Every structure is written in C-alpha cells, then in structure tokens.
Structure 1
Amino acid sequence: TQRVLPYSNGLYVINKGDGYIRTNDKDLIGTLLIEAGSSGSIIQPRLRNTTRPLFTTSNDTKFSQQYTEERLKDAFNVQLFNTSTSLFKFVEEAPSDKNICIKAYNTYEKYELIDYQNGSIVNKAEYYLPSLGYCEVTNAPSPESEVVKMQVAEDGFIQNGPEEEIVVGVIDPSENIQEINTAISDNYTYNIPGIVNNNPFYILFTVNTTGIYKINAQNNLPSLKIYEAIGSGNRNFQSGNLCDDDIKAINYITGFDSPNAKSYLVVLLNKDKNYYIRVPQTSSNIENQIQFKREEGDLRNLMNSSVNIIDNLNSTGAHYYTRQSPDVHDYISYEFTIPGNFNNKDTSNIRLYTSYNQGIGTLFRVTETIDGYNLINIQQNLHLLNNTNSIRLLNGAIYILKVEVTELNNYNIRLHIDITN
C-alpha cells in the first residue's frame, strides 16, 4: 500500500514538520505547578547560543552531517545548525478555580535528505534542527490516583506540530553548472564543452521573452531534463542577460532519466525566471549540442512535456514503451510513424492504451510544412487505461499522442501501440 513517488532521479530535501520531541521525556525542559490565580513562565533566554541538532544517516561517506547541512542550506537556506539567537518563552496564568501545570519541551524541525533513483530511496539522512519548543498545559494532578508502572517506549520521535510535507529538489553538488550568459530569444545553439566531458552536468539559462520553447540535443540524444530555480528572477536584473543568484533549490518540470531514449522538451519558460537543463552521462566521444528554439506554432500544444521519438515501429503487431510516469495532471508525449508506405490510401488499425496508469490522451496528426510543424487534433478525451477502442490511421503517417496522467498507480507508465493489417 506504499505511495507511488513519481519523483525524477536526484536529491530532495523534505521539511517533515515542526514540533518533534523524542520519546521518554528526553526533551523535557520541566514542569511548573502554578497555583490558582498565579502565573508561571518557562524561558529560553539564549544566554548561551548553543543548540544540539540530531542527525542520522544511511551513508556516512556521502550523506555526512556536513553534506546534509549543505543540502539543507541549498534547499531552505538554513545557516545556523549549532547555534540560535531566537528566544522562546511560555507563560500561563492559572484560572481562579483550579491549579494548573505546564510542561515545556525542546523541539526539532525534521528534515529528510533523500537520494531518489529509479523508483526508490538509495540514500537517506534525517536532520533534526533545534526548534522553538512545545508547551502543554494540563489540570493539576490529584492525590494520588495511584502510580502504575510502565515500560519505556521504543526510541523515536513524536510530532506535536501541524502536518507538513514540503519537498524541495536540490542541485547535485558533484556535477558542474555551466552558464549561458546571454538570454535566449528565438534560437540558440549551445556547444557542449570539453571541460565537462562524459559526466552529467547542468546548464543555467534564462529567456528574453515568456514563451514556449523546444529544447533537445542532436538527433534528440540524449534525453534532457529541465528544472526551474525556485524564487529566481525576483532580484537582480540585467536586460538580455542571465543573472545567477546561486539558487540550488530546483523544481522539476519535465524530462526522462533514460539517456538512450530519443526525446525533446516542449516547455513554457518565464523571462523572469532562471532554468536548469540537466544533460546526463553520455558514453560517446562525439560532439553534441543543445538546441533551443522558440515555438510560435502548433508545437505549443505539447507544453509541458517530453516528447518520445519512437523509431522501431516498422512491423504490425504489439509494441510497448516504458517510461517514468509523470505525476498526476502532468504530461508525457509520444511521436510515432505508422509502418508502411505513405500513399495516402493504405491504412492500419491502431490501438493505444496504458497498462496500469489512467491517462487522458489527445491524438495529433503531424504534417511538416515550410511554415513548420502542423498538429491536427484528430482524437480527444482518450481514456488510455486498458482502452479497447481502436482507430484507423494512415500508413507512413506521423502522429503525436499527448497523455495527461490522471491516476498514478505505477511508477512507470506503459504505452502500448498495437497495429493490425
């Protein structure tokens, strides 16, 4: 009954909430018994600035405390771990009727650092950042009930703060960040430099005018991913140039991790934002280029998604293609050619369906003119999950299927393209 985490490969820092306390009173500051009418206070005055963060890792050599702290700084801009100048204080006035107790606990804000790879966590660290306390008030204990013995609880935490799950992706520090210093207009070709050979790396770039862009490598290989720098473009600005604010907190937009898969990106970019492209590890010594193109035509209908180029569709029968499933309400696209000669008459029966994930699909007929690529919407509201409906398409023709995930039941999405005749 585990949730499906449709996260892209990479690092994530997760704020799992505030007000965590350890078990067995390990973080009890103390209790005050306040008589009726009176008041009582418990104070953390910061006469000393020292705090005691808690840390556990599954991998001391990669996710060390130093590394984990740098990741929390990348994500949420935390900078004080050992120290604090922030005071907290709890005050309670007991009502005129009865006496009152207040218990004060030290608390922690829980951060989880994960390395997520191909559908599971491969590295995990928990960092409990010292917080600003928890105060529970109760009625005064009566004499004496009776003391009932209790075994200690297992080691662990209890949250007393509100529910919270804030997920922030972060730049992998082991990978280089190259920059495109000039803002991108209608076209741009980025040559992949030898300074970053073979290893995966990021490309930081911005755009001149808000619009939809097609991004890809030569022959759509390898597949790329694109991120948005969270909170970028709110500050320093130079017309037609990139302003790097050293933001390592990233929002995944679209893109596959499988590098041998042909694909291209169609994304809406804001001129007041910075974006990261991640190009993966390539096992070839051949020179490559990242191409940027502003889309003014029908290709705009594919935002935001990666478009898979399907090549092996040259015989009839059953064919399937597996990719990482987009999250709910996100898109994935497929460009394919019906096998056979295009003679504008010969046709084949095509059945498109998914195996586990429910998706709404729209089918486009693709024709390239001297004005660019034209998309004719020929099928709408296709419900893909175990779809038995079939349609007759032209042999040798080119089609694009755009799929919106609506029910995420599997980490992967499996598209089937069954062809008969």
Structure 2
Amino acid sequence: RVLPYSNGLYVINKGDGYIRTNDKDLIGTLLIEAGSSGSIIQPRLRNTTRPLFTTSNDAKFSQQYTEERLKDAFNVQLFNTSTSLFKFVEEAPSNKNICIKAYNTYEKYELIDYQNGSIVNKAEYYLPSLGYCEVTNAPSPESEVVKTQVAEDGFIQNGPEEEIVVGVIDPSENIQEINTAISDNYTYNIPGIVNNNPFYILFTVNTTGIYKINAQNNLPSLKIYEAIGSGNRNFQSGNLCDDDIKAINYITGFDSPNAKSYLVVLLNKDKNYYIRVPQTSSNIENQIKFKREEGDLRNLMNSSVNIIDNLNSTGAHYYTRQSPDVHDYISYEFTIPGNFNNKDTSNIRLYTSYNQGIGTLFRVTETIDGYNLINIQQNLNLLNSTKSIRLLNGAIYILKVEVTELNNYNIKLHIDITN
C-alpha cells in the first residue's frame, strides 16, 4: 500500500479483456442448434478501431501525449487500426443447444504523474484488444423477465489480473549523452543548454563494477535509472549505442531539493543508464564526477549515501528522506560534533520512527585512493531502538540501512546525541 516510487512518470498495464457495462461493447450473441457449430468473426475487412480515453488534465495528459507514453513504455505501434484479427467458434452437443456471445475488449493502460507521495495526474487509456466470448447453455425462451435497471457506466475486466508498471523518460526533461563509455574516472560538465533545468544523462561503462557518482560538492542530489533491455542489440566497443529505449527502472536516489548526496551503484557493461540531475537553480557551474570504486565503498553498493554535516554538540536530530523499498538501501555519512581528541566521545542512539531496518555502522578513514570502512557494529535493529553507542568525537562514520518492513513513504532517521 505504501507504493514507494521515485517520483515522476509511470505507465501501468492494468490488464486485458476489459469491457464496458451494459453491453456497450457486445458484438452479438448467436445461438447454435444442437449438433451445429457457429463462429463470430472479426475479419478486419476494415482496419479502423476506437480506443477510449479519459484524463485528469487535458493540458498535460492529452491523448496524443498519453499515446506517446505507451510508445515510450511498450513501443506500442498502432492505436486505432489493427490488422490482427480474432474469431470465436463453438460446437453444440447433440442433447442441448448452446449459445455463444462475443464482446469487444480493451487492454487498460494507466498513465501517472506520481510526484512525491501522490498521483498528481492520471490518464486512463483503453487500447482496443482482441475479444472476449461467453459460452452458455441456450436459455429457455419462456423464462420470466425481470424488470432490471441498467448499471452505472464503467468497466469489467475479464482478462486475468494484471498490473505491470513501467517508468518513462519525462519528455519535458531533456536528454544529454556521454558518447564515450565511462572507464575508471570521468568528470562531466553540465552544458549550457540545460539552463539549470532538470535533464537526463545517458551513459554506459566499459568494464562492469561499482561506481560512486556525485555532483560537485555532493549537491544536487541525483538519481540513476537502468534502461530496460539495454545492451542486447547494437554495441560499439568503448562507446555507447542508442538502443532506442526510454523505458526506465529506478536504481536509487533522492528527490529532495538541496539534500547532499552521492550515489554508489553497481553498473553492468551490457546496460545503459540514465542519470537525472534536477533543477540546478544555482548559476555557478556544476559537474558530475563518475569514479569507479574498487575499495571498501562497494559495501554501500546500490545505495544513495546521505550527508549530515550539521550535528549540534548535543540534542535531537532527524533526517527524513524518501524510503527505499523492502530489501533496498539508504546510507548516511555523518561526522560527529566535537574536535578529535581520539579519547573524547559523544553518545549516539540511532532510531527510526516508522520502518524497520538492519543498520550497519562503519568508521571512515580516507586515504588518497579512497574511503576505508572499518566495521563498528552490525545487525543493528533501528525501529524505535532503545540502544546507543559511544563514538569518537570528530570522527566520521557511515550507517548503511537495509529496509526490512516498509511502513511509510518516508524513512525518518534520528541522531539523538548525548554526552
């Protein structure tokens, strides 16, 4: 019910075999005398077909657009014309008559702007499908007639239960591309033309591995997305190929404005990824550094590492962020208030108010090569945790949280410091 989804555009396939109430969609019933057989055919003598479409916003979610999003999601070719045809046939037993009736159907697509906890826009696109037919015993024509009131306009699904979601590139967010595959390091400059708006960076990597990706000063906060089904098809060694895929799958990253973060993700050579830099706002020049991490930081794999620079000497602190889904990770790099005596300590309890998680605590040492995570505490159970630890003043630590039970869209982490 929580339905975490890193906000943006999603088109769902809510299923096949939909029909409208009151037989608005019945082709017709025909009745088969025992020992004959009878079919009902859609031959496609004429191609044209009618889809049905309804939207919260015409201005944003226009039929043309919500059609294009199906192209983006499933590469749907035709919307009101099928050359694909269907018929239903039935033989009646020799004892009793049978009678077969046939309804036209629809696949039901949903298009959604899911910004930040709620669907802020929704279209429903009913794509003309290939039939539904009922076979029943011939009814006795003398059977009495019940004065029966018609039903509210709407829909019945006769196809099997289905709901499959597909993220799509927001056509209003531009795409920029890195032609060269990223190797071990790479620094990318946000071009002029993006004009501090949101946009996407398409790229690939050469040899598959774990990468830290941040922006300048770990700000803004980024998301990364795998492109579905990438990297079968065309490839040129060293570079990327377009593949032709705007259907995307969220790997990790926050939607929050002005939270400081860096991503640590696994990346596979036979896939293409989009990054989504948000509105820049700032007029200074920014950059996206891709570094391949061969060190201890792989421990944070497929996490977004959240940054807490700002602890008060003592007191309660909290940090609310979009919660990851069960068995995914959010991480937290925090440095503890006070100068580094190497004997001084501050007492640190790490709670979480709403969802359960397995917390993993590390001390961070940094060398010219990269971070080094020394292992402090494992298996920590966060949800309203009584527990505390003495950590070293001025030292730097990282908490890696695996979500175990997901009870709320946001994960609120507390750092309550005592002395």
- 1:198 CA displacement: 1.2
1:260-306 deviation line (CA, Å, top 9, x unaligned): 00000000001011000000001110001000000101100111011
- Percentage identity across aligned positions? 98
The CA deviation string for residues 181-223 of structure 1, in whole angstroms up to 9 with x for no partner, is 0001000000111111111000000000110000010100100
Q: CA deviation at 1:370?
A: 3.5
Q: Distance in 2 between matches of 1:47 and 1:319?
A: 70
Deviation at 1:353, TM superposition (A): 1.2
Task: Name the SS for the 1:299 alignment partner.
Answer: helix
Alpha-carbon distance in structure 2 between the residues aligned to 1:406 and 1:15: 28
- Between the aligned partners of 1:186 and 1:143, the Cα distance in structure 2 is 79
Q: Does 2:182 align with 1:174?
A: no
Residue 295 of structure 1 aligns with which residue?
Answer: 293
Query: Displacement of 1:259 after TM fit?
Result: 2.7
3-state DSSP of counterpart to 1:195: coil
Deviation string 1:225-250 (CA, Å, 9 cap, x unpaired) is 10111111110110000101231100
Please say if residues 221 and 259 of structure 1, whose CA atoms lie closer than 8 Å, have aligned partners that are also in contact.
no
Question: With structure 1 as the length reference, what TM-score do the two structures score?
Answer: 0.98
Instruction: Let me know the Cα RMSD of the aligned residues.
Output: 1.0
* Other structure's SS at 1:315 match: coil
Give 4+ residue runs of structure 1 displaced > 6 Å after superposition: none
Unmatched 5+ residue regions in structure 1? none
Q: Which whole-Å CA distance do the structure 2 matches of 1:332 and 1:97 have between them? A: 67
CA distance in 1, matches of 2:398, 2:240: 34
Query: Secondary structure of 1:24's match?
Result: helix
Contact kept? 1:364, 1:400, Cα under 8 Å: yes
Worse overlay, 372-381 or 162-171: 372-381
Corresponding residue for residue 352 of structure 1: 350
- Please say if residues 177 and 203 of structure 2, whose CA atoms lie closer than 8 Å, have aligned partners that are also in contact: yes
User: 1:98-127: per-residue Cα shift (whole Å, max 9, x none)?
Assistant: 211111000000000000101001111000
Q: Counterparts of 2:397 and 2:99 in 1: how far apart (Å)?
A: 71
Aligned-residue offset at 1:314: 3.1
Deviations 1:287-335 (CA, angstroms, capped at 9, x unpaired): 0100000010110011101101101113211100000111111110000
Q: CA deviation at 1:143?
A: 4.2
Larger displacement relative to structure 2 (356-365 or 100-109): 356-365
State which drifts further: 292-301 or 401-410.
401-410
Per mean C-alpha deviation after superposition, the further-off stretch among 401-410 and 51-60 is 401-410
Rounded Cα–Cα distance in structure 1 between residues aligned with 2:264 and 2:247: 22
Aligned residues: 419
Contact 2:197–2:281, Cα closer than 8 Å, also in 1: no
> For residues 345-393 of structure 1, what are the alpha-carbon distances to aligned partners after superposition, in whole Å with 9 as ceiling and x for unaligned?
1112211111111112111111112342111222122221111111111
SS at match of 1:70: helix
User: Matches of 1:381 and 1:145 in 2, distance apart?
Assistant: 70
Tell me, yes or no, if the aligned pair for 1:356 and 1:385 is still in contact at 8 Å: yes
Contact 1:59 1:124 in 2 (8 A): yes
The structural deviation recorded for 1:10 is: 0.7
CA distance in 2, matches of 1:13, 1:174: 16
Moved more, 92-101 or 279-288: 92-101
Tell me how far apart the structure 1 counterparts of residues 89 and 379 of structure 2 sit (CA, whole Å): 59
Contact 1:259-1:282 at 8 Å conserved across structures:
no
